[PDB]
Design a protein around this ligand. Structure first.
Ligand SMILES: O=C(O)c1cn(C2CC2)c2cc(N3C=CN([C@@H]4O[C@H](C(=O)O)[C@@H](O)[C@H](O)[C@H]4O)CC3)c(F)cc2c1=O
Ligand SMILES: O=C(O)c1cn(C2CC2)c2cc(N3C=CN([C@@H]4O[C@H](C(=O)O)[C@@H](O)[C@H](O)[C@H]4O)CC3)c(F)cc2c1=O
Lengths: 596, 596
């Protein structure tokens, strides 16, 4: 469960296994014929990390259904065997089977969170083959959810598909493969650090770090806290597993003004250094408080999506995206609709970007007659069990990030229907139990005629609304959109708790224009946002605006998707639309703290 | 009924009243307050001819519901009163009331066909005001048909519109206004030509023109036929109303090789000259014969649509469009979905472009539970009576055009439902009765699950199909599209009569690309057409391909319309997409005659 980010330390090797791997589509016989026991024959080459769907020009590759096999050679020095040898997969989408030589080492379900496995030393021969089989199939038991009929979420006349294909119950393309880096790392065999938990206490004008260090084996523990320049500001040797350290002259991590201490931990020979921002988060009344100050979210729902790697880790684009958000005056984004790479989370900690951290739970809705949360034995959704593992794993991975201020339990589940509360109650209970910082929890609310029956009202600390007044309703009638927006949002405002837009927007094709309200035009995108803001700016409990979307991104094919989703403020190659300049202006006049 | 195109002759003045007119939106009180009796107060200026919707930047103007008032001064020489004075409206969309000074002169229904009225000389004062009130409203009794609920033909969540608006039952924007020129012309008072009918007889290797000259008053008739250089090749004086003339050395009008004789007619002092192409049209077996040769249609459904005039007469664009069709190797187009201007028809006669001439009958479908052709007293469609007047007027206007080879009675009516045959039988009977050339008649068939019950099979001389295999069905599954296309078209091919595509295409945004099948991309548009052609090229009764559409054009707003309809081979400003070059290549290898 514990998943420390792998780093090069005095006690820990870090070997990146990324590069060109061999790649072979499964044809139904791949496991029967035990392809993982030899070199892949008649194979292609595929970059790792990357989604595989867009690297070639093959529609059958892009739209492949089922398994693929990745493989590479792994010839490592024998003196590594004096250490504990670990294979870390930061993400394999959606499910993986990992083989070393002929031998199945592990299997994983869930395409967006890391997993790892020791390599037993009796298995390492002189030359080794690493094989990773990757399953892309989605159904009523996976997160994200796939449809199990021939229905498309986006048809006039019915037809029989040529081949079976995944049918996403979500509005983004089903990019799969070895999405994020594969690495080999080592620790001391006999005594090593397995996890680190840090929390902050700011009471009585005294900043303290509380630590809890999880180990394997028997040794002595030490912890030191260091400034960015390397001055030790607190340290203790031969400590317990738990304790606290006072940080005199503590500098707080603040949105757009990050400060990270370096927390170095020793256990026997093992050494691990964890960056850590000191800050508090709390919901009080109708305010979202960061370091006891009333925060206003300004930003976006995002996607991990770039050409040609798809969902694949793209670190230059990560840095470019954060630079664009600072240029635009944003302070935050949400990990729509899955955990993002640790490289992104760590960069956000470094750059002072606030993150709403979301699970993989999109598509938990069977009625976009069996109801979504009917009993499984009557056709209800089969995701609750995996939904708990995802929450456990997500919090275990990201718990120490200062940038994470809120957990989002699901995106647009069927939360107005019968049984939703009972499905979601244990998941909220679990997230509150597991997060040592006890951060606020929410689910992101689907737009819905019976919004007063949204079970978010009974569960969430912040109400997060996805609303499309002026796009999916009142299209090209913004005066009607304004009225419909005000009627519903005055209800939410009357509940006295913080609420916010986590999505709102309008599909906009760069280069289409009209001085007169016309859907898909750059001007309409601006007018859409002006209309919504006319309402939200008058509501004192509305504490944040995150647009849909930061940038255009790939989706499944359909009559309402113009080469993907076009609601980005930026294009897929990160060029500003008219509305992106509109937001730079607007967000320049709105402070991070004390707007409402 | 008779509607000779107005021309300047030795006996006929022609005064164009086009230019800047005064323009005022009605507010409900325009007739009550009798605005037509004075200058329009607090008015704008509007170009005539033009649609009014896009000239300004006002959404309320663009989306106006109801009446508008146009007005201009009309100060004419008194010596005109020695002649018969006629006001000709080439088109006023959709309905008009015409006033001179205070006096209602005529009212017209039908937005795409000419109407005229004598100006009684006792009404002409020294200074005169011409007022034209124009109604844009559409319903179950107009052609084209408007919906009478709040439904859009292209909604996720229901909303109340801010204002009432026209709801077209058709896929093009409801452009209205004084669409085509307004002209004053004169004839002799006492004896003048009211209509001319010409037909051709090619039997026995002898080309003859049969004439029938309709007059008012008592005088002597003469007719002469002249070559383009002005050589008289047949003539007779003091003739009857009907007769025939042999044309020795006759040159036939042929597709892409036009020849027009000039037919000059005298009656008393009146003189009228009519261009006339000699050619035959006939359907025999599975062949469409022009001048006894098996024709293959290559071209488009079009729209009259340019920026900013909308539906308005744009003669430079007409010439540009014909130049592009010759550049692409097309030979034909259909007047989708209304009669086009006489200026276009006459230019097509001059340039050798073959025309399928279509009525205004689009939207004759109430179920895109009351059935379309239920009795009117039970909610059935109320268009049949006006549908006959439109057919009468269209044939009366266009009967002498060599370029017109086929009448299209309706576009995508509900022809697979009960009662369609009975609705359409009298209209086909009427068109065959009225056309002196007895040209083939068709209706354009909607795509429909029960296509074997399409009443076109019982009525039409050529089966004209609108099909979207690979767009509205099988989208991004072209291999399935090919199979579905072949299954249905082998049925049509098995009937042994000529059939053809009058629409097929794929929405394509210029500048969107992908080497791998992706809807809305330029490459997908090409692949869509390749797939269809794989099938049609193997069917010996398939005698023509007209794409949807020649060029992108404006529509109502909705989630599936990217700033209008994007199925053009060209953009709205006439720039070629990838598929336009594809068709230039393809149509360069397909002959006008003897392809199948
Ligand atoms: O053809 C139509 O009529 C509609 C089609 N679709 C589907 C997307 C094809 C609708 C979807 C609705 N929901 C689906 C996604 N929710 C968020 O919206 C973003 C976006 O759609 O841009 C996604 O990208 C985000 O991931 C997701 O969180 C919005 C609400 C809806 F309310 C109405 C319609 C239609 O009306
Ligand atoms: O959102 C969807 O799912 C669909 C939406 N629409 C409507 C246009 C919004 C459909 C329409 C269908 N008909 C409507 C128009 N016919 C011709 O098509 C051209 C075009 O549509 O390009 C028009 O411009 C031409 O004038 C017209 O003759 C095609 C058949 C259909 F069969 C399926 C759908 C959908 O499935």
């Amino acid at each position: 469960n514990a998943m420390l980010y792998p780093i090069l330390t005095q006690s820990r090797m870090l070997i990146d296994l990324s590069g060109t791997w061999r790649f072979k589509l499964d044809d139904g016989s791949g496991f029967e014929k035990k392809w993982y026991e030899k070199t892949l024959d008649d194979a292609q080459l595929m970059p790792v990390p990357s989604s595989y769907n867009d690297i070639k020009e093959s529609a059958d590759l892009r739209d492949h259904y089922g398994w693929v096999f990745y493989q590479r050679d792994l010839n490592i020095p024998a003196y590594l065997k004096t250490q504990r040898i670990v294979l870390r997969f930061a993400a394999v989408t959606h499910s993986a089977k990992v083989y070393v030589n002929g031998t199945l080492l592990c299997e994983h379900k869930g395409g967006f969170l890391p997993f790892e496995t020791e390599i037993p030393e009796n298995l390492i021969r002189d030359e080794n083959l690493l094989t990773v089989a990757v399953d892309n199939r989605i159904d009523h038991s996976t997160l994200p959810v796939g449809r199990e009929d021939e229905s498309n979420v986006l048809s006039f006349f019915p037809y029989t598909p040529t081949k079976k294909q995944n049918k996403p119950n979500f509005d983004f393309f089903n990019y799969c493969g070895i999405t994020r880096p594969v690495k080999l790392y080592t620790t001391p065999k006999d005594a090593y650090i397995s996890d680190i938990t840090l929390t902050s206490s700011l009471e009585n004008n005294t900043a303290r770090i509380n630590y809890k260090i999880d180990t394997k084996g028997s040794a002595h523990t030490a912890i030191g806290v260091y400034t960015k320049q390397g001055v030790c500001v607190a340290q203790t040797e031969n400590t317990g597993t738990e304790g606290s350290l006072t940080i005199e002259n503590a500098v707080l991590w603040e949105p757009l003004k990050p400060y990270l201490y370096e927390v170095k931990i020793s256990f026997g020979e093992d050494r691990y250094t964890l960056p850590y921002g000191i800050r508090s988060v709390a919901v009080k009344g109708n305010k979202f408080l960061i370091n006891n100050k009333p925060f206003y979210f300004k930003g976006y729902g995002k996607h991990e999506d770039t050409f040609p790697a798809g969902r694949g880790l793209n670190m230059p684009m990560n840095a470019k995206d954060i630079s664009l958000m600072k240029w635009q005056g944003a302070n935050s984004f949400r990990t729509s609709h899955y955990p993002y790479s640790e490289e992104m989370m760590r960069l956000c900690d470094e750059e002072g970007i606030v993150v709403i951290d979301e699970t993989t739970a999109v598509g938990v809705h069977l009625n976009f007659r069996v109801n979504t949360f009917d009993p499984i034995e009557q056709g209800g959704i089969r995701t609750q069990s995996h939904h708990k593992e995802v929450i456990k794993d997500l919090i275990a991975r990201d718990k120490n990030h200062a940038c994470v201020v809120m957990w989002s339990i699901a995106n647009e589940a069927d939360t107005g229907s019968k049984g939703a509360y009972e499905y979601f109650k244990p998941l909220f209970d679990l997230a509150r139990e597991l997060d040592p910082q006890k951060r606020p929890c929410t689910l992101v609310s689907l737009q819905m005629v019976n919004y007063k029956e949204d079970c978010t009202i009974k569960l969430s600390d912040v109400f997060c609304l996805n609303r499309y007044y002026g796009w999916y309703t009142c299209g090209a009638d913004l005066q009607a959109a304004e009225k419909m927006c005000r009627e519903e949002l005055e209800f939410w405002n009357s509940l006295g708790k913080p609420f916010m837009y986590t999505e709102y927007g309008a599909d906009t094709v760069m280069g289409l224009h009209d001085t007169t309200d016309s859907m898909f035009t750059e001007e309409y995108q601006v007018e859409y946002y002006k209309t919504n803001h006319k309402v939200t700016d008058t509501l004192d409990c509305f504490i944040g605006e995150q647009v849909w979307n930061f940038a255009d991104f790939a989706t499944s094919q359909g009559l309402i998707r113009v080469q993907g989703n076009k609601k980005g403020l930026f294009t897929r190659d990160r060029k500003p639309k008219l509305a992106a300049h509109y937001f730079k202006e607007r967000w320049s006049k709105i402070p991070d703290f004390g707007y409402k």
